Amino acid sequence: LLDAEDVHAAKKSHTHEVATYTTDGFMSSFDKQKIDQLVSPEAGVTSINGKTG
Amino acid sequence: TSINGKTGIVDLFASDLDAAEINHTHAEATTTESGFLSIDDKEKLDAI
Ligand SMILES: [Fe+3]
């Protein structure tokens, strides 16, 4: 009987570690939420009657 | 985050905060409620 490990092959349903400062790979899901927050943030009121701060 | 359910570029006014304008009129004075003096009452007072 053969399996993915028996032939030094990646499992049919396999996952990679999230990317780090030096190695690539997936991104963490909350990182995806973060970047989707950065683009089109609609975070609060940007200006109130032309006033900020 | 929001003011009165408004987000983003929002301009609020007196009626937006349930407030009265500078040039706003009240209910005229009657026999049961206090208010602005009517024109007829002022004319009658002046004539008397
Ligand atoms: Fe008033």
Cβ-based burial of B10 (10 A; exposed 0-12, middle 13-18, buried ≥19): middle
Per DSSP, the three-state class of B1 is coil
Write the single-letter amino acid at A14: H
What resolution does the deposited structure have, in angstroms? 3.3
Q: Do the chains contact at A47 and B12, CB–CB below 8 Å?
A: no
Q: Which residue of B has its CA nearest to A46?
A: B8
Write the single-letter amino acid at A39: V
The whole-angstrom separation of Cα A50 and Cα B32 is 45
Q: Which residue of A has its CA nearest to B9?
A: A47
Tell me how the structure was determined: cryo-EM
B2, A45 contact by CB (below 8 A): yes
Residue A12: how many other CB atoms lie within 10 Å: 7
A52, A46 contact by CB (below 8 A): yes
**CA distance to partner chain A, nearest, from residue B18 (Å):** 18
Provide the token pair at A25. 């790979």
Distances from the Cα of B12 to the Cαs of A4, A43, A48, A49, A52, in angstroms? 64, 18, 8, 7, 14
Radius of gyration (C-alpha) of chain B in whole angstroms: 19
